[PDB]
């Protein structure tokens, strides 16, 4: 039970406030602390306990969640309190780099404390909804002990990765790259359809229907990438390349941007040059691996 699983939240910015709110509404006794005291007021009025100091906030709970600007801020808060951390589980949902995650984990074992490094794939209003994804890396046992508590932040999207703490930051970037790819795809299409007086609101649901179809292509292409074998099946790179041609041309003609379609065409042109005219789109992995 949640009443038997206390948790402290250190950092009550926009995201930290929503995490504390989620812990509280799921029935955890929730201790909070922020450098700027007034950011706790709304949460205190709703039943959270205001800690007197960072030390108190750590002592209050066996599970300690951090969510501040950067890992500089994290070290500033925790360095002085090494002794205070023994036997606690620290869950750091601050966004940072791979190396920061790994170095912080190293420092934590050094002072005998358990450390998970997380990454939040969500905006504050989506915390505690099925739309929330939250990634955790580090010791599996500590994740299992606190799984039920952590699921208060997003029951469906709470996801353990592996032991390397640095995976959380890598998966974060990788998923954001997908987000920008999807959204830029949609925006290109809205601009094109806009020249024929089609509204983006009219286009959205059909765009989403298509995005859902494409997830099946992701699933089919994945083993091809791992095996290094790129059978055309469906459609050759030559067919993709020709279709990219038409998108670029019709974009230049109708008076909108053609930069992305031309950039996409260039990548395909390189795969053709490397011998993959008759291979399928999975062969494009080779272009994304080539430096600069």
Ligand X SMILES: NC(=O)c1ccc[n+]([C@@H]2O[C@H](COP(=O)([O-])OP(=O)(O)OC[C@H]3O[C@@H](n4cnc5c(N)ncnc54)[C@H](OP(=O)(O)O)[C@@H]3O)[C@@H](O)[C@H]2O)c1
Q: Which residues are annotated as a binding site for NADP(+)?
A: 12-15, 34-36, 39, 67-69, 76, 95, 234
Q: Which of 23, 71, 230, 281 binds its own copies (CB under 8 A)?
A: 281
How many Å apart are CA 41 and CA 201, to the nearest integer? 39
Nearer residue to its own copies within complex by CB, 80 or 177? 177
| Residue 69 found at the interface with its own copies (CB under 8 A) | no
> In sequence order, what are the residues at sequence separation of 6 or more whose Cβ sits closer than 8 angstroms to the Cβ of residue 284?
237, 267, 268, 271
Judged by CB under 8 A, the chain residues 200 through 259 that form the site for its own copies are 200-201, 203-219, 221-223, 225-226, 233-235, 240, 243-244, 246-247, 250-252, 255-259
Which of ligand X, its own copies, none interacts with 16 (beta carbon under 5 to 8 A by kind)?
Answer: ligand X
| Residue 123 found at the interface with its own copies (CB under 8 A) | yes
Which of its own copies, ligand X, none interacts with 4 (beta carbon under 5 to 8 A by kind)?
Answer: none
| Residue 193 found at the interface with its own copies (CB under 8 A) | yes
Which of ligand X, its own copies, none interacts with 77 (beta carbon under 5 to 8 A by kind)?
Answer: ligand X
Nearer residue to its own copies within complex by CB, 15 or 66? 15
In whole angstroms, the minimum distance from the beta carbon of 70 to its own copies comes to 11
- Do 66 and 93 contact (CB within 8 A), yes or no? yes
How many Å apart are CA 45 and CA 55, to the nearest integer? 22
Contact footprint for ligand X (CB under 6 A): 11-16, 34-36, 39, 67-69, 73, 76-77, 94-95, 120, 123-124, 235
How many Å apart are CA 87 and CA 203, to the nearest integer? 54
Judged by CB under 8 A, the chain residues 103 through 122 that form the site for its own copies are 121
> In sequence order, what are the residues at sequence separation of 6 or more whose Cβ sits closer than 8 angstroms to the Cβ of residue 101?
92, 117, 137, 165, 166, 168, 169
Which of its own copies, ligand X, none interacts with 15 (beta carbon under 5 to 8 A by kind)?
Answer: ligand X
Judged by CB under 8 A, the chain residues 143 through 182 that form the site for its own copies are 157, 159, 162, 164, 166-167, 169-171, 173-182
Size of the site for its own copies (CB under 8 A): 96
Instruction: Give 3-state DSSP helix, strand, coil % of the chain, rounded to 5.
Output: 60, 10, 30
Which of its own copies, ligand X, none interacts with 150 (beta carbon under 5 to 8 A by kind)?
Answer: none
| Residue 191 found at the interface with its own copies (CB under 8 A) | yes
Burial 14-35 (b: 16+ CB within 10 A, else e): ebbbbbbbbbbebebbbbbbbe
Q: What is the DSSP string of 64-107?
A: EEE--S-HHHHHHHHGGGTGGGTT-EEEE-----HHHHHHHHHH
Per the listing, tokens 């999207």 go with 157
Which of its own copies, ligand X, none interacts with 11 (beta carbon under 5 to 8 A by kind)?
Answer: ligand X
How many Å apart are CA 135 and CA 159, to the nearest integer? 5
């Amino acid at each position: 039970n949640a009443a038997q699983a206390p948790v402290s939240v250190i950092g009550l910015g926009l995201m930290g406030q929503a995490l504390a709110a989620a812990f509280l509404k799921a029935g955890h006794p929730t201790t909070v602390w922020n450098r700027t005291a007034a950011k706790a007021d709304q949460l205190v009025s709703e039943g959270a306990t205001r800690a007197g100091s960072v030390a108190d906030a750590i002592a209050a709970s066996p599970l300690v969640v951090l969510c501040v600007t950067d890992y500089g801020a994290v070290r500033e808060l925790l360095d002085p309190l090494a002794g205070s951390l023994k036997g606690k589980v620290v869950v750091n949902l601050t966004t940072g780099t791979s190396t920061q995650a790994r170095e912080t984990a190293e420092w934590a074992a050094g002072v005998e404390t358990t450390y998970l490094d997380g990454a939040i794939m969500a905006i504050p209003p989506d915390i505690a909804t099925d739309a929330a994804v939250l990634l955790y890396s580090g010791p599996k046992a500590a994740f299992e002990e606190h799984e039920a508590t952590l699921r208060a932040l997003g029951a469906a999207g709470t996801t353990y990765l592996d032991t390397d703490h640095g995976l959380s930051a890598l998966y974060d970037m990788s998923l954001l790259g997908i987000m920008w790819g999807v959204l830029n795809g949609f925006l290109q299409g809205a601009a094109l359809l806009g020249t024929a007086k089609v509204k983006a609101t009219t286009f959205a649901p059909l765009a989403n229907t298509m995005i859902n179809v494409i997830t099946e292509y992701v699933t089919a292409y994945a083993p091809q990438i791992d095996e290094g074998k790129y059978p055309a099946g469906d459609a050759t790179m030559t067919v993709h390349q020709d279709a990219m041609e038409h998108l670029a041309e019709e974009s230049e003609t109708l008076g909108i941007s053609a930069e992305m379609p031309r950039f996409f065409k260039a990548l395909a042109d390189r795969a053709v040059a490397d011998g993959h005219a008759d291979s399928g789109y999975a062969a494009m992995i080779e272009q994304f691996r080539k430096p600069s």
